[PDB]
Swiss-Prot record:
This is Troponin C, skeletal muscle. GO terms for molecular function: calcium ion binding. Skeletal muscle troponin C binds four calcium ions. One of its GO terms (cellular component) is troponin complex. One of its GO terms (biological process) is skeletal muscle contraction. Residues 17-52, 53-88 form the EF-hand domain. It comes from the Eukaryota. The chain holds residues 2 to 91 of 163 of the full protein. Troponin is the central regulatory protein of striated muscle contraction. Tn consists of three components: Tn-I which is the inhibitor of actomyosin ATPase, Tn-T which contains the binding site for tropomyosin and Tn-C. The binding of calcium to Tn-C abolishes the inhibitory action of Tn on actin filaments. The modification Blocked amino end (Ala) is found at residue 1.
Length: 90
């Protein structure tokens, strides 16, 4: 369907074993079973994994993860949110 370049580096930094764990949390917010969660529910995904950045970097993260602008986050865009702050500029 689609293939953003940001997803090429995201899965490149995440090991197959890591991406597997991130999937466990995906189904958590994916109560619909469609494979898409609300960017507003992401704030909850943070405290779940382990992150407490400034509310600012949060909003920017949403507009930086939706490279398509569909209005929803997908497992593919998830791996990006992880490498988003894990590899912002370091
Ligand atoms: Ca999207």
């Amino acid at each position: 369907a689609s293939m953003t370049d940001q997803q090429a580096e995201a899965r490149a930094f995440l090991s197959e074993e890591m991406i597997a764990e991130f999937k466990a949390a995906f189904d958590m917010f994916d109560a619909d079973g469609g494979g898409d969660i609300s960017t507003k529910a992401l704030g909850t995904v943070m405290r779940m994994l382990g992150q407490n950045p400034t509310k600012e970097e949060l909003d920017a993260i949403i507009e930086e993860v939706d490279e398509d602008g569909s209005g929803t986050i997908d497992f593919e865009e998830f791996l990006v949110m992880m490498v988003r702050q894990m590899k912002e500029d370091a």
